[PDB]
Ligand binder design. Structure first.
Ligand SMILES: *[C@@H]1O[C@H](CO)[C@@H](O[C@@H]2O[C@H](CO)[C@@H](O[C@@H]3O[C@H](CO[C@H]4O[C@H](CO[C@H]5O[C@H](CO)[C@@H](O)[C@H](O)[C@@H]5O[C@H]5O[C@H](CO)[C@@H](O)[C@H](O)[C@@H]5O)[C@@H](O)[C@H](O[C@H]5O[C@H](CO)[C@@H](O)[C@H](O)[C@@H]5O)[C@@H]4O)[C@@H](O)[C@H](O[C@H]4O[C@H](CO)[C@@H](O)[C@H](O)[C@@H]4O[C@H]4O[C@H](CO)[C@@H](O)[C@H](O)[C@@H]4O[C@H]4O[C@H](CO)[C@@H](O)[C@H](O)[C@@H]4O)[C@@H]3O)[C@H](O)[C@H]2NC(C)=O)[C@H](O)[C@H]1NC(C)=O
Ligand SMILES: *[C@@H]1O[C@H](CO)[C@@H](O[C@@H]2O[C@H](CO)[C@@H](O[C@@H]3O[C@H](CO[C@H]4O[C@H](CO)[C@@H](O)[C@H](O)[C@@H]4O)[C@@H](O)[C@H](O[C@H]4O[C@H](CO)[C@@H](O)[C@H](O)[C@@H]4O)[C@@H]3O)[C@H](O)[C@H]2NC(C)=O)[C@H](O)[C@H]1NC(C)=O
Ligand SMILES: *[C@@H]1O[C@H](CO)[C@@H](O[C@@H]2O[C@H](CO)[C@@H](O[C@@H]3O[C@H](CO)[C@@H](O)[C@H](O)[C@@H]3O)[C@H](O)[C@H]2NC(C)=O)[C@H](O)[C@H]1NC(C)=O
Ligand SMILES: *[C@@H]1O[C@H](CO)[C@@H](O[C@@H]2O[C@H](CO)[C@@H](O[C@@H]3O[C@H](CO)[C@@H](O)[C@H](O)[C@@H]3O)[C@H](O)[C@H]2NC(C)=O)[C@H](O)[C@H]1NC(C)=O
Ligand SMILES: *[C@@H]1O[C@H](CO)[C@@H](O[C@@H]2O[C@H](CO)[C@@H](O)[C@H](O)[C@H]2NC(C)=O)[C@H](O)[C@H]1NC(C)=O
Ligand SMILES: *[C@@H]1O[C@H](CO)[C@@H](O[C@@H]2O[C@H](CO)[C@@H](O)[C@H](O)[C@H]2NC(C)=O)[C@H](O)[C@H]1NC(C)=O
Ligand SMILES: *[C@@H]1O[C@H](CO)[C@@H](O[C@@H]2O[C@H](CO)[C@@H](O)[C@H](O)[C@H]2NC(C)=O)[C@H](O)[C@H]1NC(C)=O
Ligand SMILES: *[C@@H]1O[C@H](CO)[C@@H](O[C@@H]2O[C@H](CO)[C@@H](O)[C@H](O)[C@H]2NC(C)=O)[C@H](O)[C@H]1NC(C)=O
Ligand SMILES: *[C@@H]1O[C@H](CO)[C@@H](O[C@@H]2O[C@H](CO)[C@@H](O)[C@H](O)[C@H]2NC(C)=O)[C@H](O)[C@H]1NC(C)=O
Ligand SMILES: *[C@@H]1O[C@H](CO)[C@@H](O[C@@H]2O[C@H](CO)[C@@H](O)[C@H](O)[C@H]2NC(C)=O)[C@H](O)[C@H]1NC(C)=O
Ligand SMILES: *[C@@H]1O[C@H](CO)[C@@H](O[C@@H]2O[C@H](CO)[C@@H](O)[C@H](O)[C@H]2NC(C)=O)[C@H](O)[C@H]1NC(C)=O
Ligand SMILES: *[C@@H]1O[C@H](CO)[C@@H](O[C@@H]2O[C@H](CO)[C@@H](O)[C@H](O)[C@H]2NC(C)=O)[C@H](O)[C@H]1NC(C)=O
Ligand SMILES: *[C@@H]1O[C@H](CO)[C@@H](O[C@@H]2O[C@H](CO)[C@@H](O)[C@H](O)[C@H]2NC(C)=O)[C@H](O)[C@H]1NC(C)=O
Ligand code: NAG
Ligand code: NAG
Ligand code: NAG
Ligand code: NAG
Ligand code: NAG
Ligand code: NAG
Ligand code: NAG
Ligand code: NAG
Ligand code: NAG
Lengths: 108, 438, 132, 124, 122, 43
């Protein structure tokens, strides 16, 4: 049972900035078994990044992910108007899987 | 307090592809038997493997190899290029009975000789499907305005020889030993081998002849069961024999058309003119269809009516059962077998026609001309499978009609390579160990 | 592509059972795939309920002996169906349930780690609100 | 057991039959001739590309040869009981699949420094 | 530095990066481009096995810097240990020992020979 | 005015798919591809 902590809780940015979201686990996941999901408010969730630093077919190259010991970070550059939603960091190393806490990105 | 140790020879394999070579044990043949090398199975435990027979690479490689082997024996012998002349064909009658008049014609035509400025008026016997009329009536060959006719080579044989596509060193072949395997999914009984068993390259549509049998029950295989455009493969558990024969003598006559160029045609028939026919047992076919429909009712429901009808229409090599017996290509109507309706000592005789101009592998531009065979032709064969299809209904009834189909030669070879997989061995490994150098 | 539909909004009384279905379109066989069922409480985080892999259905350590997952293979006149039954529900089960699939064909795909895996395709989610 | 017979055992139970898989890695212009020639060329190249990597690190003729590099704790924090008795070879290569290049890089310069340190030993 | 990056340096600075050049000497129809790839692969096998066979008869198989018990003659070179490794390079040292290369290649063959099992076998 | 005698309308006999039949067809050629033989005859 690994508890995930996401940072920050609620932040705001503008069109053209870079949003950095961090995720800290309990133990040391040395195998990079982490994933970053995006869920719009009201719509269905969407998997963005699997295995920490690998993209999916249909995801643009502006997103980036990095892993270092416990700290898994996600950088979103060239921010648009359609990337406002909730972001989740979820591990699948040990049974069972546990999600993060939620991080909403507003516009201001 | 930990160090790195390199291990060589770990049992780790990846998924890849390579090239396979023939291996057989040993008048020539079409497929090169004397060019192959002269010809163990280790069971594995605590390992699973996900097999998929519809995404294999061995079927396309085998198809390309059979196509490349078919076009290597037709080259160095004689081609029949000056045969496109104006024929004069009449009917033939020599104590001939009913339902045969109209299938054979006696043709006469001019032909060049070994001298350039001379001619020779010769005659032969042709079939109905080999000549067409143009507007005594004049006739011509059917494959003349679209393809070039070359003769089949008289020193080769079309007998199928079992070969072994065998992998070199560095790769491995895995095989699923499940008795109720359906070609898709995980297999808990995987064993490694060197290479496969004897596969006979039998070219036939709608009837898997001289194939491999099942173990427990009749197997049904399909890719997309919710689509009406995918074929359905049926694998029996018992063989149903069938005896095909041709009562004609079919004497041969050699005509020299030039310098070192010979042409073998049909001469005169000594005897009666009867139909070539295949006899199949009637008592075994009913229980064969019952064992087929007992496994086929599991995919549609226990309240389904199963109708068995014949083919609708299309090409002659699709609707009719096309095969090769004794060196001669037979096309059987086979409409009397698939005629039934299943609700929830006699023998059937099927007449077959003979064609001499064969267009193989669905090609447009490369024809052939088989030579006549002297004597009486009689062969026996097994029936170890079926290729069926269904039509699109109005999704409201419980009646399903199944019709035989084919034409694509990949389905005839996918039923034998549905359990084998090719893997690539990687023997390097890195392990932690409390040890130091020197 | 691969499209999944689910049931509608069903309102149930405490004490009875409920059954949520999930129909798939595009998958080949459940032996090459794995069907995971999670949920999401309104105003809270997600929660993993159960999964079916290699024809072996299981649940978590908190929903043991309470839920039941079932699945069938292809049918010539029916889509692939995955059902989940909840018996003896409490007053704290109002959530948006989902239905996810994950392809477990390749061993070196990196999307699965010895039974537990990620979610590549999501559904629409059914709202279940229980009240007295 | 045979060829690939210990594929389902643990890492400690499969490290004793390494000589079985180490000996089965080497052994008119028709259609069946060029395929056999390309297969022999591919087998020779696949043997040489592994023998060169075995000869760079200094393990010419040894299978359980020892190195001098230390094991970093960021690669795998497991002990000797959860590796040689629980995990297999099909999972251990996928566990550290992102850290093989730095290990292959560290196995070269240490062997080079060990070979260049031997030159200052016999010069006394 | 890279592949052939120390070609302009001296013999003392280019003898430390031998691992760069020690890993770049090794790596379907009958058309005009299908036979050239097979010819290049066969030539790459031939130009590696011939160079590896010479190190096997000298007892230096698997070693980049290997030295034996062959005494260096004073008639091959009359230089010191400071005017060779610090002044001359590898492109100029090969031109001076071109008339004495086969003598060293023949003396290196018997060395790994006069060091074989004798009667100790009985 | 610069392409008065460049193109040539030619007619010729040619064999067909039947060995004992001929055909009379036409073509349009350039002046650099045909030479006269001493309308006129060209080859
Ligand atoms: C190629 O060939 C392949 C051959 O290998 C072939 O594979 C075969 O595919 C078929 C598919 O057609 C497979 O058949 C199915 O198999 C399913 C497997 O189910 C497994 O799991 C259940 C559940 O286990 C839990 O519960 C039991 C009992 O409590 C416990 O003991 C367990 O430990 C476990 O509990 C854990 O999990 C809990 C959480 O759920 C935890 O709380 C708990 O703590 C535990 O951790 C088992 O019961 C099954 O066992 C049965 O099968 C084994 C097989 O050996 C028997 O030995 C055993 O005695 C049992 O009989 C099994 O292990 C089946 O679930 C599935 O059943 C459905 O179909 C049948 C009819 O065929 C129905 O009778 C059945 O009721 C199911 O139908 C329901 O679901 C469908 C789908 O929605 C509905 O449409 C249907 O209406 C029905 O719903 C109704 O009932 C529901 C309750 O069940 C109810 O909720 C609904 O509301 C509704 O009323 C079916 O049999 C077959 O197994 C494969 N063969 C294999 C794997 O070898 C492949 O397909 C071929 N491919 C092609 C392309 O041809
Ligand atoms: C096997 O053979 C089939 C037949 O050709 C191939 O094609 C698949 O066909 C099914 C048919 O159902 C496709 O399934 C999809 O189901 C969706 C859900 O249907 C319900 O909801 C709609 C309203 O949205 C109702 O009208 C309907 O009655 C049901 O109640 C449908 O919505 C899909 O239609 C459209 O959906 C979206 C728009 O919402 C579009 O993006 C889609 O492209 C589509 O136009 C559709 O009917 C299934 O998607 C088809 N597959 C593919 C890949 O397209 C199978 O592909 C084939 N199997 C394989 C493995 O190839
Ligand atoms: C396939 O089955 C058919 C019948 O179902 C077989 O045809 C039968 O062949 C026999 C032997 O050729 C015929 O017998 C003959 O009878 C005449 C008249 O009595 C006699 O003079 C002959 O000496 C011979 O005995 C029989 O009439 C004939 N039946 C029919 C209906 O035509 C056929 O031979 C079978 N083919 C094979 C390969 O088994
Ligand atoms: C399926 O396999 C069977 C068994 O091999 C094949 O039957 C065999 O067919 C060949 C070809 O006609 C027969 O060879 C010929 O035999 C006659 C007999 O008189 C001989 O005169 C010829 O010179 C030639 O050798 C062979 O005898 C026959 N085998 C048996 C046991 O009858 C069958 O052809 C295969 N099916 C297909 C579609 O190829
Ligand atoms: C660890 O390695 C795996 C594969 O060895 C990496 O997964 C690939 O990452 C690339 C990077 O964009 C993707 O394009 C591929 O689709 C991924 N999958 C495969 C199967 O190749 C993974 O990113 C690595 N993790 C790191 C570098 O942190
Ligand atoms: C096909 O037609 C030719 C003539 O066009 C037939 O040849 C003649 O046959 C009769 C009958 O015995 C002989 O009297 C003639 O001398 C033959 N003429 C020549 C030029 O040979 C031939 O018999 C016919 N074939 C069949 C099977 O009836
Ligand atoms: C073979 O060639 C002969 C000529 O050597 C053809 O005979 C001529 O046919 C034409 C067409 O009707 C007649 O007009 C001539 O009178 C015939 N005789 C001569 C001497 O030219 C004959 O038709 C050709 N074909 C066959 C099948 O014999
Ligand atoms: C197909 O031919 C085989 C032999 O070529 C037939 O088998 C023989 O049938 C007769 C008549 O029933 C028996 O007396 C023999 O004992 C059978 N065996 C042998 C070895 O001769 C077979 O019956 C034929 N099948 C059909 C449907 O006619
Ligand atoms: C294949 O067999 C079927 C069924 O016997 C034939 O269909 C009918 O056959 C009878 C013969 O008694 C004819 O009188 C009918 O006209 C046929 N129906 C048609 C043509 O629609 C079928 O003709 C046979 N195939 C061939 C090529 O003869
Ligand atoms: C047609 O089926 C029969 C019945 O299985 C085959 O006869 C067996 O052939 C195998 C070898 O393929 C022998 O080991 C058996 O002894 C044979 N007899 C029995 C009773 O099983 C026959 O070989 C099949 N025909 C072809 C061409 O393979
Ligand atoms: C067809 O065109 C050619 C090329 O233009 C003509 O040949 C020349 O015509 C001019 C015009 O009278 C003469 O002055 C030249 O002397 C001709 N050249 C030669 C080499 O004779 C030709 O006259 C044209 N023919 C017709 C019938 O218009
Ligand atoms: C094509 O063939 C015809 C044959 O019909 C040729 O026409 C003959 O040409 C010669 C030479 O000028 C004349 O003597 C004849 O009178 C023509 N007619 C016949 C019926 O023989 C014609 O010349 C050929 N060439 C072309 C280009 O048409
Ligand atoms: C060029 O030659 C072609 C022949 O290939 C001429 O076409 C014929 O013209 C006559 C006269 O109008 C028609 O009666 C024929 O029907 C045409 N076709 C054939 C096949 O003979 C054409 O007129 C010539 N001139 C030009 C300017 O194209
Ligand atoms: C020759 O056979 C054809 C085809 O059966 C038939 O139409 C024609 O009437 C026959 N002619 C004679 C003279 O028998
Ligand atoms: C060739 O002739 C046959 C028979 O008349 C005809 O069906 C076919 O369409 C012809 N093909 C071409 C290309 O003219
Ligand atoms: C075929 O004809 C030959 C003579 O050319 C004869 O010897 C043989 O018996 C005939 N075959 C039969 C009647 O089956
Ligand atoms: C259909 O009938 C068979 C007869 O043995 C039975 O085994 C099977 O369970 C039936 N199918 C269903 C869905 O009940
Ligand atoms: C199929 O059977 C029907 C009914 O006898 C017949 O009319 C039709 O011609 C048959 N089709 C073929 C291709 O034989
Ligand atoms: C097909 O079956 C029906 C029903 O028994 C029968 O009347 C008909 O004659 C059969 N047709 C053939 C060609 O056997
Ligand atoms: C497979 O596992 C069982 C127990 O899990 C063990 O007894 C057996 O030795 C294993 N097989 C091999 C080949 O190691
Ligand atoms: C271990 O990894 C850390 C972080 O990348 C690195 O700073 C350190 O040098 C490594 N140590 C060893 C012994 O490889
Ligand atoms: C080239 O010569 C300069 C001296 O001017 C020296 O500093 C440099 O290191 C030399 N380059 C190499 C690659 O040794």
């Amino acid at each position: 049972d690994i508890q995930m902590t996401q940072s920050p809780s609620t932040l705001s940015a503008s069109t053209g900035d870079t949003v950095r979201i961090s995720c800290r686990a309990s133990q040391s996941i040395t195998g990079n078994w982490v994933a970053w999901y995006q869920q719009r408010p009201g719509k269905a969730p969407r998997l963005l990044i699997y295995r920490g630093a690998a993209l999916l077919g249909g995801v643009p190259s502006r997103f980036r992910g990095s892993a270092a010991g416990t700290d898994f970070t996600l950088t979103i550059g060239n921010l648009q108007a359609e990337d406002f939603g909730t972001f989740y960091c979820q591990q699948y190393d040990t049974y069972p899987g546990t999600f993060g806490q939620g991080t909403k990105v507003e516009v201001k | 307090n930990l160090w790195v140790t390199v291990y060589y020879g770990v049992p780790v394999w990846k998924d890849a592809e390579t090239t396979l070579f023939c291996a057989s044990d040993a008048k020539h043949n079409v497929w090169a038997t004397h060019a192959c090398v002269p010809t163990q199975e280790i069971h594995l435990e605590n390992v699973t493997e996900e097999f998929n027979m519809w995404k294999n690479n061995m079927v396309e490689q085998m198809h390309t190899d059979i196509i490349s082997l078919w076009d290597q024996s037709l080259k160095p012998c004689v081609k029949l290029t000056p045969l496109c002349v104006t024929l004069q064909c009449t009917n033939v009658t020599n104590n001939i009975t009913d339902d045969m008049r109209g299938e054979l014609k006696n043709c006469s035509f001019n032909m060049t000789t070994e001298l350039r400025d001379k001619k020779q008026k010769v005659y032969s016997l042709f079939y109905r499907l080999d000549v067409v009329q143009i507007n005594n009536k004049e006739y011509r060959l059917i494959n003349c305005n679209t393809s070039a006719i070359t003769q089949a080579c008289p020193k080769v044989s079309f007998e199928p020889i079992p070969i072994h596509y065998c992998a070199p060193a560095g790769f491995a072949i895995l095989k699923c030993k499940d008795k109720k395997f359906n070609g898709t999914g995980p297999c808990p009984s995987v064993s490694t081998v060197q290479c496969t068993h004897g596969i006979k390259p039998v070219v036939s549509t709608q009837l898997l002849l001289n194939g491999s049998l099942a173990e427990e029950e009749v197997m049904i295989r399909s890719e997309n069961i919710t689509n009406n455009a995918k074929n359905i493969l049926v694998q029996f558990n018992t063989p149903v024999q069938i005896n095909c024969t041709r009562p004609n003598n079919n004497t041969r006559k050699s005509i020299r058309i030039g310098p070192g160029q010979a042409f073998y045609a049909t001469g005169d028939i000594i005897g009666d003119i009867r139909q070539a026919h295949c006899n199949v047992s009637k008592a075994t076919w009913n229980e064969t269809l019952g064992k087929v429909v007992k496994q086929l009712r599991k995919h549609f429901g226990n309240n389904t009516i199963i109708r068995f009808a014949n083919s609708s229409g299309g090409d002659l090599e699709v609707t009719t059962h096309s095969f090769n017996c004794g060196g001669e290509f037979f096309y059987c109507n086979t409409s009397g077998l698939f005629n039934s309706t299943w609700i929830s000592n006699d023998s059937i005789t099927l007449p077959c026609r003979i064609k001499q101009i064969i267009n193989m592998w669905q090609r447009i531009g490369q024809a052939m001309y088989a030579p006549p065979i002297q004597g009486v032709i009689r062969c026996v064969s097994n029936i170890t499978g079926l290729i069926l299809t269904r039509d699109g209904g109005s999704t409201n009834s419980t009646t399903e009609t199944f019709r035989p189909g084919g034409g694509d030669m990949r389905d005839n070879w996918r039923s034998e390579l549905y359990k084998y997989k090719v893997v690539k061995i990687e023997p390097l490994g890195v392990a932690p160990t409390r040890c130091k150098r020197r | 592509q691969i499209h999944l539909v689910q049931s509608g909004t069903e309102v149930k009384k405490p004490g009875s059972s409920v059954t949520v279905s999930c129909k798939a379109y595009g998958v080949n066989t459940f032996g090459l795939y794995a069907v995971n069922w999670v949920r999401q409480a309104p105003g809270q985080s997600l929660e993993y309920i159960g999964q079916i892999w290699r024809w072996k259905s299981s649940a978590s350590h908190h929903f043991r002996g309470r839920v039941l997952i079932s699945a069938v293979d292809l049918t010539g006149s029916s889509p692939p169906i995955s059902s989940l039954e909840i018996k003896n529900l409490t007053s704290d089960d109002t959530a948006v349930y989902f239905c996810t699939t994950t392809s477990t064909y390749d061993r070196w795909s990196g999307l699965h780690h010895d039974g537990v895996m990620a979610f590549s395709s999501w559904g629409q989610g059914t709202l279940i609100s229980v009240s007295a | 057991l045979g060829f690939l017979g210990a594929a389902g055992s643990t890492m400690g139970a499969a490290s004793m039959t390494l000589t079985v898989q180490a000996r089965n890695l080497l052994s008119k212009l028709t259609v069946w001739g060029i395929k056999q020639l390309q297969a022999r060329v591919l087998a020779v190249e696949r043997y040489l590309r592994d023998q060169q990597l075995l000869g760079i690190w200094g393990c010419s003729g040894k299978l359980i040869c020892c190195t001098n590099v230390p094991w970093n704790s960021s690669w795998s924090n497991r002990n000797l009981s959860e590796i040689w008795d629980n995990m297999t070879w099909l999972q251990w290569d996928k566990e550290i699949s992102n850290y093989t290049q730095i290990i292959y890089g560290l196995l070269e310069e240490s062997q080079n420094q060990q070979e260049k340190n031997e030159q200052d030993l016999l010069a006394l």
